[PDB]
Design a protein around this ligand. Structure first.
Ligand code: AGS
Ligand code: AGS
Lengths: 264, 544, 603
């Protein structure tokens, strides 16, 4: 047994007799360079034999005759294999390859006879941010250390003061917020809408429900403000004058903009 | 000049995707970007390349992009041909392809259009359309360029069809003869691309409340096929071509014919090249949002009493009900719906279900939410039917086959689908909901089609108690008139009462009056009904 | 390939004069089997031809149909030079090929693959009858240049007859249910059946086709004149109605040879459920299935369990059957809302657009050799109930309808999640009165999972801990390693067998093992059955019939499959009797407590 059961080369050499074929088959059907992932070709050759076929069988094929293929591994973490020939095939070349392969297997047989057609090793290559959470502030009524006197009125005596700034500050925030929005609006109406008599309601209801249905929404009257701001920061072309209801807007003439957007 | 116009378009466009389109480097992606797109494409079999439109605008001050947009269909073959001159150089995919086809699909357009904005003036132009799909059609292979074989010369002709009628050469280009006998079509040497036709309809946000939503039919070609799914909101992008329909006769009348031949009857149909269907991700949503608006959120989230500032600012008109308003604010902010171990998946959504005595302003909450919650739907229920509510089966003449109607539930995906008067809805329709409550997905086996569509939809309710108003005398058991399950699946419950008082009814009356006194619209809550939307669209992403 | 005369010669070198392993020509046998069988269809063992000449095999990509059409005519002249009578016997012979390694699933087909050879799996959704297909308009009927007397506008009418007719059966093939990811409608592909392959297949049954992938049009224009309806159609060339690694099954046995498997499986049957071992047990039992046994003597009795789960709000029954949908092999989930009896069972219709008779596999048909999972029974019309009762009794669906006659087979088991009339369990009141389902369909089922929700100060606390930990555990190459292994650590937080092991396990079981019985206890279990009959006549009314007995062995064989015994064991049969007797116990009235002792003689 120990001397002859190791004569199971037929059960592995036959793998080389057909693999290339299906490989060639894929090669002759795939114009993408026929990249191979064993998770598909392995079931294919399995069906081609109906036997259990695992990557170890390809590893034994590599062990017996390592030059007939490339066995590199994909960057995703999968080991692939392609053909060394620079054209498809000449079936006589394939026949001679199978012949020299079985001859190599017989050389292995002789020079070995212990060794049960072991496997070769693989040729391995060498290889806070404004997350607005608040997980602590909700802990408990920790706010118990400061046992101050009526000094709190002191703080409050300044509170109203900041209420003047704070409010106005919030106001400037829109002077800020709306600002960034209009940075795209002079490319919203511009880049698509060259109808000259455009009104206000239509253009607004276009702005809302435009890309402002994505991550960053906006409201209607806010769109009206955006329009008023665009006109004011560019009265050269954009001329808006109201008739009875709704301010009709001008006839577009496509300037360059950021040169004035810097005036935030 | 139009020849050299298209040729200048070619030069400019080849130049654009030639040099870098993205300035970023060392922090984002490499300078040259569409070269990298081509490289990615060459290894695989993408068969099409997407390019930004903003960059096109940023190429030649928009002039190039403007020209591409205004008149587009004239340039589709022009630009598709210009693309080869590039790709032949860098990636030799095309000779190894043995095929020469690339759907140059645009995306990220600056100005979406509601579907009723579609005119004929926009013919042949490029445009983006928001909407809701419905009744997809099965994909069918469509011929693009065919090989006609001469009847006697038997020569090959690379004849191009234009989705109009069988085209055909006139003289056999084989100069051996100039015959006119019908060149024999071939299917083998004929590259055909399958396309799927979906009926898109206008959504609710843009239609004025009270008007029937117009629709249309759009066609998806190339790899864009199968990307649609009944119910999914989409923002298609592509051409606005017209297809001839011989089926238009009679009532219009005057329509002309091609006589100095037969009447050319036409109908509009968008043809979309690219589809987008979306609707720890703060890594995405935040940096996606510009630094400015970060300040606005920063404010509306760093304030201490937001959770209170919010809840008393969800029903500006309604008076009080700080219980229910809370129940709604939590509705629009779903759970996590994260699946379990590969075993099963569990629901992550909330279903508040008000039940109130008369004049409790329970329909106001709905006819508000459905106007403030994104992608929502309001159905009186008793007028509707169970089949309509979950999914409909209907026949289509395209392939003579049965298919799906999205319905309220599927087109209400990822949004609140409010309802009225459950009690009035006979059980025959109460039943059709259950699977859209806990199992979260509908499953249908009718007329041969077996399918299952996931409906991740919050629901609601406003049914009235059995006797209109319910006896305080009686208990609650024999008082709701609804079975155990649908009584359980509602992960809230609000039996709203209505009782007499003075220090309440005076306030309520003053409030309603102030409402009817338009001038006294002091109703301004802290947070507008708009900044609440953006604040949500942020908070929807935490999955604690 | 015009000079291909010499190429046909070179491939006909393999024609007869090839043998192997002590002669015995692969086709020297086939030619005489045809001369004696007259089946006008050659087999082509692709395994051996692949060894013969690589170029010939590879020629199945450029002009594969042209290649095969050249090949089969010379095969015809070959069997004719061997049998000069054979050419006159039949009209023409087309070959068939054995097997390919190309297993492109229906979800994967590209333009590169079309016009080439493809071997696909799937299920026959529905089929049609024989067509006399059309196939100077030879088969155009859309191309008429000047062949009309009034050709300006006065229309000339061609007939649709006197034209060549090909045996033509258009079969719809769809992706295997269960494998279809949730949400996506399964693809449809029209495969074509011809002279030898006509009617060789039914719906509801697994198939594997080997035909080419044509881009052919259909003359049913229906859209525009010079525009037929183009379908990417598979042309069938061979049909197969029908593995894993050795040490796989080896360690598999190593596990299944333990003593805890019959309960480790249970405790791993449900990933995220607390309690309900009894219901999980019945789930596992009707999941594994038992060995069926045809009976030409009296009536074929299937060995397939049918669990009815009389649920109650709150108890995770629909989650159980959803798990089952995922884990089992042939799950067909269908709820009693979109019942439409025509849908559950098979039906036969005429299509309005093409005026063609088709018959479409139903949920029971689409589930054959698997599990059909239905729920909300009491929420479906009674006619659905009647049709399903019929199907369960005959475990199949005969049909003899307008223009068609056949008998589909629907072995597939049924799991059913119910809901008692009105609300919950009223009381210990009888199960029948507690549900609006008919006694016949009740007896059609064997196992009745009676679940109940009851308030408890403690058991609910532990259950709650469990559920909360469940919602806690829910939520490059080395990152994927660290992720897969962490998912497996969570697979081990539910300590018994991981899932993938268990689905491979159920596949292995329902494939290989087919246990049987010994004479020893079958008459002593009939003794126990008689004792049950006396405890049931002491109960007044009761459905204790042959079904109630046969269920016992039908469950014990499943238990043997669990143990992989090939023959029933003692402890397994005792488990079976326990499950059946107490499932019965639950159905009964107050007597239940008395019953706990009355029929206790077993335990
Ligand atoms: N709490 C409230 N505060 C102010 N106005 C209210 C309030 N409740 C009701 N109303 C007004 O009274 C009208 C009746 O409101 P609802 O009772 O919600 O009507 P509804 O939704 O049709 O009720 P049912 O049950 O369907 S008949 C509404 O138009 C409200 O404007
Ligand atoms: N042991 C358990 N562990 C975890 N969740 C459980 C358990 N038992 C019940 N559940 C819950 O039960 C839910 C699903 O129960 P279902 O079987 O769907 O009840 P149900 O049959 O749908 O109720 P009906 O059909 O409307 S009467 C899960 O989402 C869980 O929340």
């Amino acid at each position: 047994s120990i001397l002859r059961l190791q004569d199971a080369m037929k059960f592995v050499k036959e793998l080389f007799t057909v693999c290339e074929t299906v490989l060639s088959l894929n090669a002759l059907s795939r114009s993408t360079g026929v990249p191979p992932e064993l998770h598909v070709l392995l079931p294919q050759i399995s069906s081609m034999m109906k036997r259990k076929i695992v990557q170890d069988d390809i590893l034994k094929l590599l062990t017996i005759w390592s030059d007939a293929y490339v066995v590199e591994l994909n960057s995703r973490g999968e080991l692939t294999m392609n053909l060394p020939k620079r054209d498809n095939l000449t079936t006589l070349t394939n026949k001679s390859r199978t012949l020299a392969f079985v001859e190599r297997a017989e050389s292995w047989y002789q020079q070995v006879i212990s060794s049960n057609s072991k496997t070769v090793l693989s040729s391995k290559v060498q290889t806070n941010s404004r997350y607005l959470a608040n997980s602590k502030e909700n802990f408990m009524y920790k706010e118990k250390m400061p046992d101050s006197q009526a000094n709190l009125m002191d703080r409050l005596r300044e509170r109203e003061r900041r209420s003047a700034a704070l409010l106005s500050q919030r106001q400037k925030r829109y002077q800020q917020f709306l600002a960034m929005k209009m940075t795209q609006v002079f490319d919203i109406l511009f880049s698509l809408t060259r109808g000259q008599p455009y009104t206000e309601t239509y253009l607004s209801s276009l702005i809302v429900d435009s890309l402002q249905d994505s991550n960053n929404p906006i409201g209607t009257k806010e769109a009206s403000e955006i329009l008023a701001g665009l006109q004011g920061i560019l009265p050269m072309d954009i001329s808006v004058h109201q008739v009875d209801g709704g301010l009709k807007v001008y006839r577009w003439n496509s300037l360059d903009k950021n040169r004035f957007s810097k005036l935030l | 000049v139009d020849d050299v116009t298209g040729e200048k378009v070619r030069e400019a466009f080849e130049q654009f995707l030639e040099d870098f389109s993205v300035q970023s480097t060392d922090t984002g992606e490499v300078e040259k970007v569409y070269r990298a797109q081509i490289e990615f494409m060459k290894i695989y079999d993408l068969n099409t390349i997407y390019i930004d439109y903003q960059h096109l605008s940023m190429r030649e001050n928009g002039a190039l992009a403007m020209a591409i947009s205004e008149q587009y269909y004239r340039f589709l073959p022009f630009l598709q041909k210009g693309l080869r001159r590039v790709v032949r150089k860098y990636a030799p995919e095309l000779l190894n392809t043995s095929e020469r086809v690339f759907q140059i699909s645009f995306f990220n357009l600056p100005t979406v259009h509601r579907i009723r904005d579609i005119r004929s003036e926009k013919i042949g132009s490029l445009l983006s359309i928001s909407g809701t799909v419905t009744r997809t059609s099965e994909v069918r292979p469509e011929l693009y360029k065919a090989s006609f074989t001469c009847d006697m010369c038997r020569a090959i002709v690379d004849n191009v069809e234009q989705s109009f009628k069988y085209t055909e050469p006139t003289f056999c280009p084989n100069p051996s003869c100039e015959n006119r006998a019908f060149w024999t079509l071939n299917v083998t040497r004929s590259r055909f691309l399958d396309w799927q036709k979906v009926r898109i309809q206008e959504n609710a946000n843009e239609i004025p409340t009270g008007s029937m939503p117009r629709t249309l039919d759009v066609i998806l070609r190339g790899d864009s096929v199968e990307r649609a799914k009944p119910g999914d909101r989409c923002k298609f992008t592509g051409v606005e071509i017209v297809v001839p329909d011989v089926t238009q006769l009679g009532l219009p009348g005057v329509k002309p014919s091609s006589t100095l031949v037969r009447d050319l009857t036409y109908k509009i149909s968008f043809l979309a090249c690219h589809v987008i269907s979306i609707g720890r991700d703060q890594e995405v949503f935040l940096n996606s949002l510009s630094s400015d608006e970060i300040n606005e959120l920063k404010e509306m989230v760093k304030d201490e009493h937001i959770y209170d500032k919010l809840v008393r600012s969800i029903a500006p008109a309604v008076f009080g009900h700080e219980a229910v308003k809370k129940g709604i604010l939590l509705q629009m902010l779903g759970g996590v719906h994260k699946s379990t171990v590969e075993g099963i998946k569990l629901r992550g959504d909330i279903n508040i279900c008000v039940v109130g005595d008369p004049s409790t302003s329970k329909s106001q909450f709905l006819k508000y939410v459905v106007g403030f919650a994104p992608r929502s739907v309001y159905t009186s229920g008793k007028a509707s039917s169970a089949a309509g509510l979950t999914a409909a089966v209907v026949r289509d003449e395209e392939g003579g086959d049965y298919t799906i109607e999205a319905g309220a539930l599927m087109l209400a995906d990822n949004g609140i689908c409010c309802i009225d008067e459950f009690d009035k809805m006979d059980i025959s329709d109460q039943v059709a909901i259950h699977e859209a409550m806990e199992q979260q997905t509908i499953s249908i086996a009718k007329a041969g089609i077996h399918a299952t569509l996931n409906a991740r939809t919050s629901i609601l309710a406003a049914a009235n108690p059995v006797g209109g108003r319910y006896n305080r005398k009686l208990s609650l058991r024999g008082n709701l008139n609804m079975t155990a399950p649908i009584m359980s699946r509602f992960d809230l419950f609000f039996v709203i009462l209505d009782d007499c008082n003075e220090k309440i009814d005076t306030e309520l009356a003053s409030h309603i009056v102030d409402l009817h006194m338009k001038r006294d619209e002091a109703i301004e809550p802290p947070f507008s009904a708009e900044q609440l939307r953006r604040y949500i669209k942020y908070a929807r992403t935490f999955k604690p | 390939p015009n000079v291909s005369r010499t190429i046909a010669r070179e491939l006909k070198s393999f024609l007869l004069e090839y043998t192997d392993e002590t002669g015995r020509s692969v086709y020297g046998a086939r030619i005489r089997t045809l001369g004696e069988m007259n089946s006008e269809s050659l087999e082509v063992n692709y395994r051996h031809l692949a060894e013969s000449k690589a170029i010939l095999a590879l020629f199945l990509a450029k002009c594969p149909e042209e290649m095969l059409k050249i090949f089969d005519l010379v095969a015809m002249e070959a069997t004719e030079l061997h049998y000069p009578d054979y050419a006159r016997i039949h009209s023409e012979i087309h070959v068939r090929i054995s097997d390919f390694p190309t297993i492109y699933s229906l979800r994967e087909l590209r333009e590169s693959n079309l016009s080439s050879l493809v071997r696909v799996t799937g299920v026959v959704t529905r089929r049609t009858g024989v067509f006399p297909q059309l196939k100077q308009d030879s088969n155009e009927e859309i191309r008429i240049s000047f062949c009309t007397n009034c050709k300006s506008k006065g229309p000339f009418r061609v007939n649709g007859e006197k034209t060549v007719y090909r045996n033509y059966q258009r079969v719809t093939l769809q992706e295997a249910p269960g494998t279809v990811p949730p949400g996506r409608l399964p693809r449809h592909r029209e495969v074509i059946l011809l002279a030898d392959l006509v009617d060789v297949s039914k719906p509801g049954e697994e198939v594997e086709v080997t035909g080419i992938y044509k881009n052919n049009y259909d003359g049913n224009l229906n859209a525009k004149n010079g525009f037929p309806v183009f379908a990417t159609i598979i042309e069938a060339n061979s049909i197969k109605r029908r593995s894993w690694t050795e040490e796989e099954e080896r360690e598999f046995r190593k596990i299944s040879r333990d003593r805890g498997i019959i309960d480790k499986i249970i405790s791993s049957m449900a990933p995220s459920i607390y309690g309900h071992r009894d219901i999980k047990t019945a789930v596992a039992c009707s999941l594994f299935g038992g060995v069926p046994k045809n009976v030409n003597g009296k009536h074929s009795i299937r060995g397939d369990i049918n669990v009815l789960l009389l649920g109650d709000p709150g108890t995770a029954k629909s989650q159980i059957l959803k798990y089952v949908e995922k884990t089992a092999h042939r799950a067909v989930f269908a709820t009693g809302q979109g019942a439409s009896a025509v849908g559950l069972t098979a039906s036969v219709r005429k299509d309005p657009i093409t005026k063609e008779w088709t018959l479409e596999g139903g949920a029971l048909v689409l589930a054959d050799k698997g599990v059909c999972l239905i729920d909300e029974f009491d929420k479906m019309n009674d006619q659905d109930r009647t049709s399903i009762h019929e199907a369960m009794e005959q475990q199949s669906i005969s049909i003899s309808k307008a223009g068609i006659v056949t008998t589909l087979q629907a072995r597939c088991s049924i799991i059913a999640a119910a809901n008692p009339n009105g609300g919950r369990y009223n009381s210990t009141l009888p199960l029948a009165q507690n549900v609006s389902l008919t006694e016949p369909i009740l007896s059609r089922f064997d196992i009745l999972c009676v679940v109940r929700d009851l308030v408890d100060e403690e058991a609910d606390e532990r259950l709650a801990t469990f559920v909360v930990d469940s919602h806690v555990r829910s939520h490059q190459l080395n990152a994927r390693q660290r992720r897969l292994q962490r998912q497996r650590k969570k697979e081990e937080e539910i300590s018994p067998i991981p899932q993938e092991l268990l689905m491979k396990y159920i596949h292995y079981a329902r494939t290989k093992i087919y246990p049987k019985l010994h004479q020893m206890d079958m008459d002593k279990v009939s003794r126990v059955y008689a004792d049950l009959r006396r405890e049931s006549i002491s109960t007044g009314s009761f459905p204790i019939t042959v079904r109630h007995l046969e269920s016992i062995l039908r469950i014990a064989e499943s238990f043997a499959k669990m143990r992989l015994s090939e023959f029933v064991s003692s402890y397994d049969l005792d488990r079976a009797i326990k499950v059946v007797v107490d499932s019965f116990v639950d159905a009964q009235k107050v007597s239940v407590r008395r019953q706990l002792r009355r029929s206790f003689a077993i335990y």
